[PDB]
Design a protein around this ligand. Structure first.
Ligand SMILES: C[S@@+](CC[C@H](N)C(=O)[O-])C[C@H]1O[C@@H](n2cnc3c(N)ncnc32)[C@H](O)[C@@H]1O
Ligand SMILES: [Zn+2]
Ligand SMILES: [Zn+2]
Ligand SMILES: [Zn+2]
Lengths: 6, 429
C-alpha cells in the first residue's frame, strides 16, 4: 500500500 | 467535485488530478474521509478502532476484548464494521488470522451493502471506477489474490453477500492498487484505508503534495508551488532509493514505469550509490556485485525479522554494513537502509543509546537524498529528538524536535495535533 516507508 | 481542482485525462497516466487555482507550499488542497479503514492488529489498545485517537485508558469491547475505543459512542459508531470481526475473533480464537488486505476488503464489501450510492469520499473518483490491472496479473499474483479470496470466505461469510470470484479478483486488485497505509508521526504503520479521491492522484518521485492523516481523515498539502493547469502528484513509495530500485517497486506494485524529472535526469543516483574514494578505485563490476548483494540483504533481512532474534537481526546489519563499507560510503542508501533497520532493532530492545548512535549517522544523508519537505526526514528528526530528550540531552533534543516541527508545519499543517504534542514535549522538558 501507498506509503513513505516499506 | 473539489473546489480549485478537477479530474482529467493525464496522457500516458490514465486519469489524474489537475489544479485550477494556485496552491502555495503548505496549503491544504483537499481532505478526504476514509471510505473504509482498519486499525492494524499490533496497534489495538493504543488507538481507538473508530477514530484512530491515540489515548491512554481506551475502553475494551466486552465481547471480543480485542477492540478498544475512546468511549461508548466510538464503540457504537464502529459496530457496523466491528461486527464483521467481533464474534469471529472469539469463535476462531487463535485461528483468527485474516491478512490486513482481507480485513479492509471485508469492510469495503460491508460499506457497498449499507451505502451503495456515491459517498463524500468519492467526489472525483469512485471505488467501483478504481484501476485494477487485472489484465497485467501473472499466475503468482492471481494465486496470492486467490489465497485472499479464500480467507475472505473463511472469516467473513456471516454478514457478507459475496459477488462471483471474478468480481472479487478485480476488487482485491483494486485494493492493492489504490489502498493506503495510515502512518503515525514516526511513520509507524497504524492501519490501511481506502481514500478514493486521494487515489486519483498519479505518482511522481518529485511530488508536489504530501498525504498526511488527522485520525482517519486524509489531508493533501502542497510541498511545491502548484499553478493552474498543473497535475497534482504524490509519491507512492519511499524516495530514498535510486531510479532502478524505485521503478522496480513501481512496476511490481503499480504496473508502470515513472518518467518524472528524477527518473529522467537520474540526478540523485550518483550520491545515493556513493562509492568510497580509494587509492585503487573500485571496478565497475565490483560496484555492480555490491549493489546486487545490497538488494539481496535488504530482502534477506525483510524475511529474517519475522523469525530471527534481536541479536541475530543486529548481526545481519553489522556484518552487511562491514562487507558494504569496503566499496560503499556511509551516506550510500544501502548502508543507510541497514543502519535504519539496526536503529529499529535497538528501539525495540529499548537500547536508546544504540538507537541514537545509528540515528545520528542517518540524519545528514537523509536530508540530502530526500525531497525538501519529507516525512521520512521529519520522522528521523522526531525520533532523534525523543531519544536525546529521553537520554537527558535536552538542548540537542529541543533542536531536533524543532527541525521535525519545521517540516511538519508544511506537510501536516501548523495546527496539527502531532505538532501540539511535540511542542508539549519541548515545554515539559
Ligand atoms: C492509484 S491509480 C492513480 C489514478 C489512475 N491514473 C487512474 O486512472 O485510476 C495508480 C495507477 O495510476 C497509474 N499511474 C500513477 N502514476 C503514474 C505515472 N507517473 N506514470 C504512469 N502511470 C501512472 C498506474 O496505472 C497506477 O497503477
Ligand atoms: Zn474514538
Ligand atoms: Zn468486539
Ligand atoms: Zn519518478
Amino acid at each position: 500500500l501507498k506509503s513513505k516507508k516499506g | 467535485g473539489l473546489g480549485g481542482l478537477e479530474r482529467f485525462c493525464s496522457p500516458g497516466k490514465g486519469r489524474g488530478l489537475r489544479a485550477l487555482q494556485p496552491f502555495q507550499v503548505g496549503d491544504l488542497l483537499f481532505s478526504c474521509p476514509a471510505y473504509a479503514y482498519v486499525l492494524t492488529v499490533n496497534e489495538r489498545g493504543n488507538h481507538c478502532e473508530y477514530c484512530f485517537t491515540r489515548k491512554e485508558g481506551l475502553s475494551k469491547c466486552g465481547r471480543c476484548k480485542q477492540a478498544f475505543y475512546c468511549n461508548v459512542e466510538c464503540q457504537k459508531e464502529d459496530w457496523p464494521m466491528h461486527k464483521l470481526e467481533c464474534s469471529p475473533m472469539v469463535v476462531f480464537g487463535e485461528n483468527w488470522n485474516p491478512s490486513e488486505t482481507v480485513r479492509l476488503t471485508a469492510r469495503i464489501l460491508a460499506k457497498q451493502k449499507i451505502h451503495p450510492e456515491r459517498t463524500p469520499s468519492e467526489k472525483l473518483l469512485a471505488v467501483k471506477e478504481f484501476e485494477s490491472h487485472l489484465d497485467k496479473l501473472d499466475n503468482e499474483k492471481k494465486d496470492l489474490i486467490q489465497s485472499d479470496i479464500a480467507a475472505l470466505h473463511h472469516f467473513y461469510s456471516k454478514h457478507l453477500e459475496f459477488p462471483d470470484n471474478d468480481s472479487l479478483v478485480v476488487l482485491f486488485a483494486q485494493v492493492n492498487c489504490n489502498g493506503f497505509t495510515i502512518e503515525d508521526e514516526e511513520l509507524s504503520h497504524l492501519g490501511s484505508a481506502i481514500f478514493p479521491d486521494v487515489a486519483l492522484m498519479n505518482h511522481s518521485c518529485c511530488p508536489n503534495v504530501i498525504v498526511t492523516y488527522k485520525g482517519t481523515l486524509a489531508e493533501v498539502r502542497a510541498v511545491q508551488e502548484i499553478k493552474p493547469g498543473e497535475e497534482v502528484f504524490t509519491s507512492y513509495i519511499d524516495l530514498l532509493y535510486p531510479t532502478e530500485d524505485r521503478n522496480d517497486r513501481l512496476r511490481d506494485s503499480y504496473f508502470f514505469t515513472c518518467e518524472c524529472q528524477e527518473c529522467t535526469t537520474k540526478d540523485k543516483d550518483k550520491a545515493k550509490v556513493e562509492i568510497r574514494k580509494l587509492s585503487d578505485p573500485p571496478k565497475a563490476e565490483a560496484i555492480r556485485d555490491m549493489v546486487r548483494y545490497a538488494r539481496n540483504v535488504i530482502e534477506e533481512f525483510r524475511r529474517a525479522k519475522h523469525y530471527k532474534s534481536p541479536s541475530e537481526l543486529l548481526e545481519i546489519c553489522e556484518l552487511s554494513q562491514e562487507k558494504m563499507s569496503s566499496v560503499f560510503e556511509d551516506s550510500n542508501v544501502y548502508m543507510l537502509h541497514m543502519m535504519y533497520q539496526a536503529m529499529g532493532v535497538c528501539l525495540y530492545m529499548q537500547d536508546w543509546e544504540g538507537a541514537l548512535q545509528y540515528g545520528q549517522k542517518i540524519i545528514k544523508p537523509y536530508s540530502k537524498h530526500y525531497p525538501l519537505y519529507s516525512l521520512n526526514v521529519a520522522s528521523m528528526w522526531l525520533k532523534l529528538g525523543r531519544l536525546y530528550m529521553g537520554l537527558e540531552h535536552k538542548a540537542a533534543g529541543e533542536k531536533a524536535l524543532k527541525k521535525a516541527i519545521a517540516i511538519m508545519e508544511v506537510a501536516h499543517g501548523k495546527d496539527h495535533p502531532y505538532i501540539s504534542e511535540i511542542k508539549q514535549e519541548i515545554e515539559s522538558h
